Write a protein that binds this ligand. Structure first.
Ligand SMILES: *[C@@](C)(CO)[C@](*)(O)[C@H](Cc1ccccc1)NC(=O)[C@H](Cc1c[nH]c2ccccc12)NC(=O)[C@@H](C)NC(=O)CN1CCOCC1
Ligand SMILES: [Mg+2]
Ligand SMILES: [Mg+2]
Ligand SMILES: [Mg+2]
Ligand SMILES: [Mg+2]
Lengths: 195, 226, 222, 211, 196, 233, 204, 195, 196
């Protein structure tokens, strides 16, 4: 798929992901949710080749959910991101690699800190205050470099995110049909229904 | 295509089949592959059909003008030379493979010519997709000092070999006989061994079977008076 | 580089009647511009009142027929000499063809027989296994020449009743075996004229409740 | 091909064309591009006819086994997913199959789009095949949730007609289906030749065409 | 193709097979590969028949025009005209030509002109696809100032082997003798040369 | 997948009233080089079958060994190996055809064209072709490679259809085969003068003729042919 | 990509008793997309009719070109061009572009005004003439037309019978071709009257 | 460029053309007018390869304007369309062809009829009641086939055109930044400033 | 490479040049291309050195193991082992091998195994890039039942010409004589064979 953004503020992580799905020359769907909840305080958005994205995401989800049941314990965002990276680094040298880029947004309940990890299909992991995949960063990073502070509120994070989407909507040739926004904080995961 | 050329006692004979193809489809079932360059110089062509005609008509035109200029009857070597120099210049892009034969004041002649401009002399020759089927017959039955009637038989037998055994060849046999001291006789459809049998049914429709929307008279005449 | 496929030409034709079915095919076998055989049978009696023909690449066609005939044999062994219905044979062949989805049998396949209600049936396949029951089907080299003729003379397409001018169609009256064989012979005579790979001979297999009958007719050999 | 399917108040409509191609040659005028998996499940077809038939008939095998083991009819969500998982095993091997899984289950009416890549999308309306863009034009401008069964059947019928007309590789005939909680219902085979002229007169559309 | 030209006491002899192939099909089994460009200057042709015929026709034209103006041309002069065509049009030609002629002053001379358009004056020359198989035989058996009968036997035996091993070569063996006495054509059939 | 290296050219054959005839030259070519001049490409199997092979010679030698092993294996625990349960031409052919089609299906073919000629138990003539693709066909006349293009036309003038077989004698059929071999020597660049010929008759059995030569060749007319058009001398 | 099958279309011509007929479909497309259902492919220059299939730009271009050439022919010769002569003009004009050809399949049809003899002819894109007695076909459904014409045609048909035969040959061939259809026109030609009929066919 | 539409109604021709221009991954302009007035009652819209479009359009414009001055007379839309077709048919066999597709909308003052001509880069001319180039027709023709009448008013033509643009905006992956609409009638050419 | 093996009255002689090239560079000018697979069964190698060495090593292993179990193997048996390797691995090999050996029963025998993996028993055999130039010479000069001294001269003259014309061939001429008397190695240097 196309655009996935992420921003880590004071007390939460915010993930924005496009709604469009295109087959051939036709847009089949304009309300697609490009994300999966891995655990109550960990969310993963994804973008890449058709089919591979969801298959990979659901496969990761199943593994983390299995871990949670076995240990009766939630893995830290850092631990989950490392597991995901290894699966992708394992995948890149396979017969047919999984062509998927992800952002992992989580709230670490132990450290009481939000955390955002960016991982590409090669297995290239980086922890960031804000991140993006594909061409999304080319348009948005200049705004984020300028406006981002680490002490921002969730509301300020959403306003800076609106500005990023507006810039994308102005200068990108592709119509990605807006974004679904989700917030990850101490209380868990929730969706912003009006954006 | 299957085309042949056979020399005999007092002249030369050429022959050809009458099938033309568009891949595996038969476009024309009674094509004419025997072309006239001059009254007593005829050629048979295989390969790109338009090229064999075009190149034949061009050289035939220039041969006629040459004959008029020189007050002499055209020679086969002239047509041969003009053809090969033309074909050579286009480096095989004009896909004309011809058998050229005729009689002139010098005698009787038989040549083959390829698309790239190479010429060849012989007593018996064959060209086209059915050239191997025909040449098998020629190599089996040809001899020195053939008569006119023996040569026509050999020629048409060679073409038949192509008709039956080669899918690129079929239908009828055309022949042209060029004898010294005589007019050339063009025998169109000398043989007709492939007539279609009667159909089992008539597919003539009842009048009114086809649905029509509009009718109108077409004005083909010029603008009228008054 | 080695090319495992080839084209042996030929053309086949299946027509379903009210209480009969025909499967016809020319007897010519070819490579490129050469003739291999003027009489090489292409339509086979496979048992259980079923006839079959695999047109295209002869080696793959012979292998498929050979396998289906074998499938019929094992159907009797495994299911108490039960008769293989035409619909069950069709489905079985789909699975034989899809076996090689990634190295296909390069053949257009047709089978004919009678359904369980005694009516005539023709089934048509593509090289990878898609099949469907039809009333009329020509397959092979001259399939595009013949099919339009059958749409016109079997299903009365584009034909209307005079006087009405396009308002009322020609009613779909059934065809007799004698009428069908005329259309088959005229189809192959016409195809032989305009297609170089078609000719030499025509072999027709007619299927009725009484059994499988053959008829042979000569075609032009050029 | 052109296929479409959409959810509405009284279930789901499914409409398909009937043409089959072999390059420019029309190999079939009357092909069935729907599969009756069970009395409450339908499957549309677009792409390689062989792939569509084999895998959806194999899906029907797997849906029947589900009923025998669990003593309960399979959901549309689960059925669509079994199919998408089959596609993922032959991922990259060259299959060509675009299909909608239409049906009614405990959650009400269900509609899922599945393709050869393993894609699986839930939605109220879908259209696949070479002529899907033409069908979407008619659907998007006339679709409502508040449609009557009579109007809904006509919409899907009319949408295929639109595509059959413009798209060279769509046409032949229209096959209609209506899925209810009592099961699906076949609403006939409609020749496009006859339907076109009928619609032109009654609706007044296709003014550009002479008849 | 198998072609050769050999000098001897009284002049020079050209020799060639008669086979022309289009792949594995023998298009002509009685080809004349020995071609005349002047009264006593002949050439042997190898490579593209179209190209070698076109060239030899042009050379024949140049030497006819040379003769009209300046009298009988030398064999070296003829070889130069061949070379000038083969060299300047090397990108569009595939021609391997042996030139052979007789003067009264220079006697028998042989020039070979391979693919590039280079010229090499030699006592004897061999060319064509079948020449590869007789480099050893010809080197061992060639002598200078042979008699006519010795030279004919040398060419006959040599081409006999070339034909034996090369599929692109075969048919009859044609020869052309160039001396003060005149121009003699010879021919040797399979039943004669195969049993050597 | 491979390419053929040392090759054998045409194999030609036909049916006649009481049996079949088959012939093939004794050459093993290495491209345009006529490398090997003593190669037998007709291989008898018992006293009722002859297998003629063209194409790759290394693959031919492989097939030759499969057949030799087939005879050995048929004799095992078979008291009627020289009688009722002897190898038939149809058995030998179907074996080869099974092998050829399997090899092409593994994309590792035997680069050959094979004609199995023989006479069955009931006196019926057997003549069938198979090649590297596993393609099989039967006809009154059969030929491989160049023979298909040049020999078949000549042999079909003798036996144009099935009804012409009883009317064709062994003297006429042999004459036709020998003429065809001459024509191939004139016109096939990868052929030789020396060849082998085999006759399998239902009465007189298997006659295997070796060291045959093409004779009565026409070359004399070549002396008159001069130049390529305008040349007179 | 293949210029001869981008726009699609078909033309067929037949001879009858003292008459000829020529017919064409009306479709013009951009591959799968249908653009026009009014693209007539038959033109006439006096009493000589020309049908052209293939690349539409070249069809339009050639019509304008032969209109140009026939108008000048008439001014100089002081008479309308005949079918046999026009056929040679088409062949000449096509071959002069031998190495940059018009991607077309022309079909000539007409009656010689002097001899009264019916005449039809077809060409390849490069000028080779196919002068047939029975029928000529051209287009993307040429294989289909060959099968229909070869089986339905019989010689010496009357104008009103010939109409039915050519109409059914065209209609049923077009219904087995994706790139042909969307309407059809048939010209029935006699020595001094010409009728033009639009056929009713399926619009898919 | 991307999308150009055309529709001929009772007494006018309406041309709609996208506003977007894209270089690389960036949309440089969102207000571009892809049209040229050839004469007071003739308008030509265009779409194709970068640069070629404007060069060709302006070259045609100059030729028609030259004709107008020379004869003191406006060429009919039919005459102009034929001139344009010939230039494109001439162009396709050139060393470097001009890769431009056009719609020519004009009002014939002699016949008092609106006229719409569609011409592609090969020189394929067709007169139509409504037309489009590229992929635009795939989405819009089904709507036009359904809703179009020849006796439509200009206002009804604009409403049907809005429906076409809405469908394009829903099902096309590319964001073409809306359209500039222009009307050609007996009084000349005018632009609809609110659309 | 230029290699040959010739049978004669008393047994068989193998012969070869000594040049190994990597393009136009002579990597080794004193190569030993005559290799022993058994006491009196030797082979001449042509093609890929890696492939022909690997094969000959395997064959030597098979015949050593054959001898331990079944006694001295025939020359035909050795040729069969070569063939079996060359034929079954033809897709991954480039090896042209001549096999030559002496029995007391069968005397001198020669088998050639070209690229495909076919086997051909012959009176004499030639192979390698330089063999092409001496097909004519060898055919004309070979006789059956020659003496040892005649056979050595035949090989010496033959390879002399192959070396003369083939750039891929050269250096010294090595020979191996296989008779009842034993195994004799010979060597002939340029100054000897060049002046022939
Ligand atoms: C449109 C017609 C687009 O072509 C549809 O998608 C249609 C879908 C369909 C058709 C029949 C059953 C189920 C679904 N597709 C085709 O007809 C398809 C198009 C096609 C052709 N080659 C393709 C390659 C990849 C993807 C699509 C391809 N055609 C076929 O599948 C052809 C090969 N099959 C047949 O013609 C099968 N029938 C021929 C007549 O006899 C019965 C079998
Ligand atoms: Mg990264
Ligand atoms: Mg034939
Ligand atoms: Mg359509
Ligand atoms: Mg050296």
């Amino acid at each position: 798929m196309d655009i996935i953004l992420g921003i880590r503020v004071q007390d939460s992580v915010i993930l924005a992901s496009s709604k469009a799905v295109t087959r051939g020359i036709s847009v089949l769907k304009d309300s697609d949710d490009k994300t999966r909840q891995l655990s109550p305080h960990t969310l993963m958005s994804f973008a890449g080749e058709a089919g591979d994205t969801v298959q990979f995401a659901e496969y990761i989800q199943a593994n983390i959910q299995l871990y949670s049941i076995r240990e009766d314990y939630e893995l830290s965002p850092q631990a989950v991101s490392s597991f995901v990276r290894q699966e992708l680094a394992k995948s890149i040298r396979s017969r047919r690699p999984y062509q998927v880029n992800v952002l992992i947004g989580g709230y670490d309940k132990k450290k009481n800190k939000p955390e955002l990890y960016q991982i590409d299909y090669l297995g290239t992991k980086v922890e960031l205050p804000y991140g993006a995949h594909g061409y999304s960063g080319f348009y948005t990073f200049s705004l984020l470099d300028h406006h981002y502070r680490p002490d921002m509120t969730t509301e300020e994070g959403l306003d800076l995110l609106k500005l990023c989407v507006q810039e994308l909507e102005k200068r990108m040739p592709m119509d990605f049909k807006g974004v679904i926004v989700k917030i990850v904080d101490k209380d868990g995961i929730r969706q912003v229904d009006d954006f | 295509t299957t085309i042949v050329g056979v020399k005999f006692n007092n002249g030369v004979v050429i022959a050809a089949d009458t099938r033309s193809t568009q891949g595996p489809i038969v476009a024309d079932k009674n094509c004419a592959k025997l072309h006239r360059i001059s009254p007593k110089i005829w050629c048979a062509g295989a390969g790109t059909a338009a090229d064999t005609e075009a190149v034949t008509q061009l050289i035939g035109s220039n041969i006629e003008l040459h004959s008029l200029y020189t007050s002499r009857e055209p020679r086969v070597v002239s047509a041969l030379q003009m053809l090969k120099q033309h074909l050579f210049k286009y480096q095989g892009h004009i896909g004309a493979y011809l058998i050229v034969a005729g009689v002139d004041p010098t005698g009787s002649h038989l040549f083959s010519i390829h698309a790239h401009g190479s010429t060849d002399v012989g007593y018996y020759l064959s060209l086209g997709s059915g050239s191997l089927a025909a040449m098998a017959v020629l190599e089996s039955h040809w001899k020195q000092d053939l008569t006119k009637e023996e040569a026509i038989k050999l020629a048409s037998d060679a073409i038949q070999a192509g008709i039956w055994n080669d899918l690129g060849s079929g239908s009828n046999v055309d022949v042209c006989v060029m004898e010294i001291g005589k007019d050339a006789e063009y025998l169109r459809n000398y043989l007709t061994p492939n007539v279609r049998e009667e159909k089992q049914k008539s597919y003539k429709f009842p009048r009114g079977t086809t649905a029509v929307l509009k009718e109108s008279i077409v004005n083909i005449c010029d603008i009228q008076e008054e | 580089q080695f090319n495992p496929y080839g084209d042996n030409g030929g053309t086949i034709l299946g027509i379903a009647g009210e209480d009969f079915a025909v499967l016809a095919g020319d007897t010519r076998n070819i490579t490129d511009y050469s003739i291999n055989s003027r009489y090489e049978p292409k339509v086979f009696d496979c048992g259980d009142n079923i006839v079959m023909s695999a047109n295209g690449f002869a080696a793959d066609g012979d292998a498929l027929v050979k396998r289906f005939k074998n499938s019929v044999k094992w159907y009797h062994f495994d299911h108490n000499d039960k008769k293989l219905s035409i619909n069950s044979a069709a489905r079985n062949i789909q699975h034989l063809l899809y076996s090689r989805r990634f190295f296909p049998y390069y053949v257009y396949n047709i089978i004919a027989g009678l359904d369980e209600d005694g009516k005539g049936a023709v089934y048509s396949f593509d090289p990878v296994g898609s099949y469907q029951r039809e009333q009329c089907r020509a397959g092979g080299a001259a399939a595009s020449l013949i099919m339009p003729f059958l749409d016109n003379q079997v299903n009365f397409k584009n034909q209307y009743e005079p006087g009405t001018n396009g308002k009322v169609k020609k009613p779909l009256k059934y065809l007799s075996v004698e009428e069908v064989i005329k259309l088959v012979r005229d189809s192959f005579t016409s195809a032989t004229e305009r297609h170089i790979q078609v000719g030499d001979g025509l072999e027709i297999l007619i299927v009725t409740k009484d059994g499988v009958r053959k008829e042979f007719y000569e075609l032009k050999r050029d | 091909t052109t296929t479409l399917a959409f959810k509405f108040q009284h279930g789901v409509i499914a409409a398909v064309d009937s043409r089959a191609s072999a390059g420019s040659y029309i190999s079939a005028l009357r092909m069935n591009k729907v599969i009756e998996i069970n009395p409450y499940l339908l499957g549309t077809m677009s792409g390689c006819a062989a792939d569509c038939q084999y895998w959806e008939r194999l899906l029907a095998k797997e849906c029947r086994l589900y009923y025998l083991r669990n003593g309960e009819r399979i959901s549309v969500s689960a059925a669509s997913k079994l199919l998408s998982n089959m596609m993922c095993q032959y991922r990259g091997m060259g299959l060509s199959m675009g299909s909608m899984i239409c049906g009614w289950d405990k959650k009400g009416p269900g509609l899922y789009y599945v393709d050869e890549h393993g894609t699986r999308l839930s939605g109220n309306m879908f259209s696949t095949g070479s002529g899907n863009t033409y069908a979407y034009g008619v659907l998007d401008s006339n679709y409502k949730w508040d449609l009557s069964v009579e109007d809904a059947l006509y919409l899907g019928k009319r949408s295929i007609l639109a595509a059959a007309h413009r798209d060279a590789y769509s046409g032949g005939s229209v096959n209609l289906y209506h899925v209810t909680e009592d099961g699906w219902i076949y609403h006939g085979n409609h020749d496009v030749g006859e339907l076109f002229w009928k619609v032109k007169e009654e609706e007044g559309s296709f003014n550009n065409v002479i008849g | 193709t198998s072609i050769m030209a050999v000098t001897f006491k009284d002049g020079v002899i050209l020799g060639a097979d008669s086979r022309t192939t289009t792949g594995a099909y023998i298009a002509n089994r009685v080809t004349d590969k020995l071609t005349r460009v002047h009264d006593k200057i002949w050439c042997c042709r190898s490579g593209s028949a179209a190209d070698t015929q076109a060239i030899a026709d042009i050379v024949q034209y140049h030497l006819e025009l040379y003769t009209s103006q300046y009298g009988t041309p030398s064999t070296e002069t003829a070889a130069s005209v061949f070379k000038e065509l083969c060299y300047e049009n090397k990108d569009n030609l595939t021609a391997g030509i042996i030139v052979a002629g007789y003067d009264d002053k220079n006697k028998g001379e042989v020039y070979t002109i391979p693919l590039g358009g280079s010229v090499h004056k030699l006592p004897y020359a061999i060319a064509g696809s079948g020449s590869t198989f007789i480099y050893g035989y010809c080197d061992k058996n060639f002598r200078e100032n042979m008699s006519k009968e010795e030279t004919v036997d040398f060419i006959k035996h040599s081409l006999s082997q070339a034909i034996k091993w090369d599929g692109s070569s075969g048919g009859v063996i044609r020869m052309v003798v160039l001396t003060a006495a005149g121009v003699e054509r010879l021919i040797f059939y399979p039943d004669e040369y195969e049993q050597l | 997948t491979q390419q053929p290296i040392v090759t054998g050219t045409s194999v030609i054959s036909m049916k006649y009233d009481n049996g079949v005839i088959i012939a093939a030259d004794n050459l093993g070519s290495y491209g345009s080089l006529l490398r090997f001049n003593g190669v037998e490409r007709l291989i008898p199997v018992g006293d009722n079958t002859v297998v003629g092979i063209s194409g790759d010679i290394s693959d031919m030698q492989h097939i030759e060994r499969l057949l030799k092993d087939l005879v050995t294996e048929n004799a095992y625990d078979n008291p009627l190996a020289d009688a009722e349960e002897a190898l038939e031409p149809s058995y030998i052919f179907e074996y080869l055809a099974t092998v050829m089609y399997q090899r092409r299906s593994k994309m590792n073919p035997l680069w050959n064209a094979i004609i199995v000629a023989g006479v069955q138990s009931n006196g019926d003539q057997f003549l069938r072709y198979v090649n590297l693709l596993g393609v099989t066909y039967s006809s009154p006349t059969l030929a491989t490679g160049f023979g298909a293009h040049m020999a078949n036309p000549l042999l079909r003038k003798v036996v144009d259809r099935e009804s012409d077989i009883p009317k064709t004698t062994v003297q006429v059929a042999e004459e036709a085969i020998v003429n065809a071999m001459r024509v191939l020597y004139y016109r096939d660049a990868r052929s030789s003068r020396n060849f082998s010929l085999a006759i399998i008759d239902k009465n007189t059995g298997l006659t295997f003729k070796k060291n045959l030569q093409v004779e009565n060749m026409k070359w004399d007319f070549a002396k008159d042919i001069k130049g390529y058009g305008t040349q007179k001398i | 990509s293949d210029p001869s099958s981008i726009n699609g279309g078909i033309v067929v011509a037949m001879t009858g008793k003292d008459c000829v007929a020529i017919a064409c479909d009306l479709r013009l497309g951009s591959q799968s997309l249908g653009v026009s259902n009014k693209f007539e492919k038959i033109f006439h220059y006096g009493h000589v009719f020309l049908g052209i299939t293939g690349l539409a730009t070249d069809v339009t271009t050639l019509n304008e070109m032969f209109r140009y050439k026939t108008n000048l022919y008439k001014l100089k010769e002081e008479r309308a061009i005949e079918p046999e002569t026009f056929t040679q003009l088409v062949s000449s004009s096509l071959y002069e572009r031998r190495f940059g050809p018009y991607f077309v399949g022309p079909v000539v049809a007409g009656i010689n005004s002097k001899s009264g003899k019916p005449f039809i002819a077809g060409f390849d894109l490069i000028g080779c003439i196919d002068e047939a007695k029975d029928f000529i076909v051209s287009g993307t459904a040429s294989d289909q037309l060959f099968g229909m014409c070869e089986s339905l045609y019989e010689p010496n048909l009357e104008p009103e019978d010939l109409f039915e035969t050519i109409s059914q040959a065209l209609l049923n061939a077009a219904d087995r071709d994706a790139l042909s259809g969307w309407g059809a026109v048939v010209y029935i030609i006699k020595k001094d009257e010409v009728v033009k009929r639009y056929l009713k066919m399926r619009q898919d």
